[PDB]
């Protein structure tokens, strides 16, 4: 339904929220009354019209298929190339993941998308990451790899991945320190 501002613009008259609510209730009753085409088109004067995108598969020098994607987490930024076939080998900055991420937590973060879509070992990946710490880089690589994998997994799997949260860029970033307080929210010890 057109908002009170739109209704005011149409009626060149100031309105109160109560008046607008009364009018909207009357319109709802009209529509529910099983009206005719003339009434429906009259109501259309007041009615107001209100998924993940998949990267395109490409082919390497040997013609073997791959997909490319990018992602960011905290200050970290990563770009991932996921090939259609492989033994699960992931090379970050040219270093195998088990050596680039000594932390089992970050290795689990890398694992998460493939494990979700039941593809452990079914692809090889080459990722380049920069900025942020170990965990930020792991998250960024996870996001990039998931976005690339969307190029291969079915649409049902893509939607399931989105619902699991593998394809949402985590907006949570550091909050600026404010003057007169210790940190983003830690105020100074109230003196007495």
Partner 1 sequence: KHLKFIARTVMVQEGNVESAYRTLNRILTMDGLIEDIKHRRYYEKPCRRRQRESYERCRRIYNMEMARKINFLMRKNRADPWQGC
- Report the residue number, 11 or 184, with the smaller CB distance to partner 1: 11
CB of 29 to partner 1, least distance (A): 7
Pick from 186, 75, 171: nearest CA to 131: 75
- Report the residue number, 25 or 186, with the smaller CB distance to partner 1: 25
- Report the residue number, 29 or 177, with the smaller CB distance to partner 1: 29
Pick from 172, 184, 151: nearest CA to 74: 172
Rounded to an integer, what distance in angstroms lies between the CA atom of residue 158 and that of residue 109? 18
The site for partner 1, by CB under 8 A, has a size of 3
Who's near 153: CB < 8 A, 6+ residues apart?
A: 117, 119, 161
Size of the chain, expressed as the number of residues it contains: 192
Q: State which of residues 5, 25, 48, 103 lies at the interface with partner 1 (CB under 8 A).
A: 25
CB of 135 to partner 1, least distance (A): 59
- 26-55 residues in contact with partner 1 (CB under 8 A) are 26, 29
CB of 26 to partner 1, least distance (A): 5
State yes or no: residue 115 binds partner 1 (CB under 8 A): no
SS3 for 78-110, per residue? Answer: EEEEEECCCCCCEEECCEEHHHHCCCHHHHHHH
Binding site for partner 1 (CB under 8 A): 25-26, 29
């Amino acid at each position: 339904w057109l908002i009170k501002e739109e209704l005011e613009e149409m009626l060149v008259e100031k309105l109160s929220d109560l008046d607008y609510m009364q009018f909207i209730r009357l319109l709802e009753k009209l529509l529910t009354s099983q009206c005719g085409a003339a009434e429906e088109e009259f109501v259309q004067r007041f009615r107001r019209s209100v998924k993940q995108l998949i990267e395109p598969v490409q082919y390497d020098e040997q013609g073997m298929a791959f997909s490319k994607s990018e992602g960011k987490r905290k200050t970290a930024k990563a770009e991932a190339i996921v090939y259609k076939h492989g033994s699960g080998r992931i090379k970050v900055n040219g270093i195998d993941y088990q050596l680039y991420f000594p932390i089992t937590q970050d290795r689990e973060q890398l694992m998460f998308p493939f494990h979700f879509v039941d593809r452990l070992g079914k692809h090889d990946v080459t990722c380049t990451v920069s900025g942020g710490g170990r965990s930020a880089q792991a998250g960024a690589i996870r996001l990039a790899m998931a976005k690339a994998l969307c190029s291969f997994v079915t649409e049902d799997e893509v939607e399931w991945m989105r619902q699991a949260g593998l394809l949402t860029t985590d907006p949570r970033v550091r909050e600026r320190k404010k003057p007169g307080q210790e940190g983003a929210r830690r105020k100074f010890t109230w003196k007495k």
